[PDB]
């Protein structure tokens, strides 16, 4: 009530170019008539007996009206100085969510258009399930000043609606984003990829790996893998779809280093394929003994 100023520089009030702006006197009791002067231009805009009291409207806001305004009551107790800044209402920000595991996902946002004014963001979400919409829950934003809100302990089968609202001293703009955890899931590549030789088989390479650290322990959703191997300086990749955490190649060239890389995906074909793991190199076993003699 006592001259509601929005978040920003202390002593500034905001408006939109081409529209009509309304200034307010800070140190007033809502009704005490005041006088308005543009500093440097002694032409009084509105006198005390103006009709609307402690505030001031401007017909057509432009850069010539943007500046410093002084309001003082009749008594002689100066309410304060008000600076007019011009800008635009907020536009619906660009929101994009993602997930590395089936339990927690995180969303990011960015303003779709510059407003030029100090801006904050409200983040919320609600489950649509499938029974109906649950109450709105906050999307806790990331600390350290990051534009990122996280959702923890999410339901894999439910469907969410993320609400990112961009707010500046001229209004708000809401961007809703329907998000289903089954669609945005993309795990991290598997770790600990090892390409080993097999004793007694000069054409075999044992490739073993593990689940990524991003996949939680004791999972209810497993991962199916897809492995690609390729001999040294060959152009074509050979794609095999293994079962489990192992794949015994039987097509390797004897005495040639092979490059192997894997990718993961939810076993129910849900989401997309993980990015390719870093390439691991391996050479088949050498079992022919050296130094022969006659017999
Ligand atoms: C997306 O999110 C945005 C922001 O999170 C949201 O816009 C905001 O919605 C809230 C909730 O309706 C608005 O808050 C209202 O504010 C008015 C004016 O101050 C109040 O009168 C309302 O209070 C009533 O309810 C209270 C709760 O019980 C009572 O205690 C109180 O006595 C009143 O009865 C209410 O709080 C808010 O004004 C907007 N705008 C903002 C924050 O800029 C938007 O609706 C969301 N869109 C979705 C979910 O689709
Ligand atoms: C999801 O959040 C929980 C907190 O309840 C945390 O223990 C878990 O590690 C998070 N998931 C991942 C992949 O980090």
From Swiss-Prot:
Domain Fibronectin type-III: 89-188, 189-286
Organism, as annotated: Homo sapiens (Human)
Coiled coil: none
Cell cycle in keyword set: no
Any one GO MF annotation of this record: interleukin-11 binding
Post-translational modification: A short soluble form is also released from the membrane by proteolysis. The sIL11RA is formed either by limited proteolysis of membrane-bound receptors, a process referred to as ectodomain shedding, or directly secreted from the cells after alternative mRNA splicing. mIL11RA is cleaved by the proteases ADAM10, ELANE and PRTN3.
Cellular component terms (Gene Ontology): external side of plasma membrane; extracellular region; plasma membrane; receptor complex
Name listed for the protein in its UniProt record: Interleukin-11 receptor subunit alpha
Tissues where the protein occurs: Also expressed in normal and malignant prostate epithelial cell lines. Expression levels are increased in prostate carcinoma.
Assembly description: On IL11 binding, forms a multimer complex with IL6ST/gp130.
Function: Receptor for interleukin-11 (IL11). The receptor systems for IL6, LIF, OSM, CNTF, IL11 and CT1 can utilize IL6ST for initiating signal transmission. The IL11/IL11RA/IL6ST complex may be involved in the control of proliferation and/or differentiation of skeletogenic progenitor or other mesenchymal cells. Essential for the normal development of craniofacial bones and teeth. Restricts suture fusion and tooth number.
Positions glycosylated per UniProt: 104, 163
UniProt gene name: IL11RA
Associated clinical condition: Craniosynostosis and dental anomalies: A disorder characterized by craniosynostosis, maxillary hypoplasia, and dental anomalies, including malocclusion, delayed and ectopic tooth eruption, and/or supernumerary teeth. Some patients also display minor digit anomalies, such as syndactyly and/or clinodactyly.
Regions of this protein lying in the Extracellular compartment: 1-295
Family stated for the protein in its record: Belongs to the type I cytokine receptor family. Type 3 subfamily.
Domain Ig-like C2-type: 4-87
Motif (WSXWS motif): 273-277
GO BP term (any one): head development
């Amino acid at each position: 009530s006592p001259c509601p100023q929005a978040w920003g520089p202390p002593g500034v009030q905001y408006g939109q170019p081409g529209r009509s702006v309304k200034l307010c006197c800070p140190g007033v009791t809502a009704g005490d008539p005041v006088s308005w002067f543009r500093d440097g231009e002694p032409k009084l805009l509105q006198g005390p007996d103006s009709g609307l009291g402690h505030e001031l409207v401007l017909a057509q806001a432009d850069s010539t009206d943007e500046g410093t305004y002084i309001c003082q009551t009749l008594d002689g107790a100066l309410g304060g100085t008000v600076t007019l800044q011009l800008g635009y209402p907020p536009a619906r920000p660009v929101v994009s969510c993602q997930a590395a595991d089936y339990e927690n996902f995180s969303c990011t946002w960015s303003p779709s258009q510059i407003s030029g004014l100090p801006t904050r963001y409200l983040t919320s979400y609600r489950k649509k399930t499938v029974s109906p919409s649950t109450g709105p829950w906050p999307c806790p934003q990331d600390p350290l000043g990051a534009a990122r809100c996280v959702v923890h302990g999410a339901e894999f089968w439910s469907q969410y609606r993320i609400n990112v609202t961009e707010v500046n001293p001229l209004g708000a703009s809401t961007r809703l984003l329907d998000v289903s955890l089954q669609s945005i899931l993309r795990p991290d590549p598997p770790q600990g990829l090892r390409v080993e030789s097999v004793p007694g088989y000069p054409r075999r390479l044992r490739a073993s790996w593990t689940y990524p650290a991003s996949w939680p322990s004791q999972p209810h959703f497993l991962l199916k893998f897809r492995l690609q191997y390729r001999p040294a300086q060959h152009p074509a990749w050979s794609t095999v779809e293994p079962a489990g955490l192992e794949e015994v190649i039987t097509d390797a060239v004897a005495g040639l280093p092979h490059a192997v890389r894997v990718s993961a995906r939810d076993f129910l074909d849900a989401g997309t394929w993980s990015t390719w793991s870093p390439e691991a190199w391996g050479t088949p076993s050498t079992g022919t003994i050296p130094k022969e003699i006659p017999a």
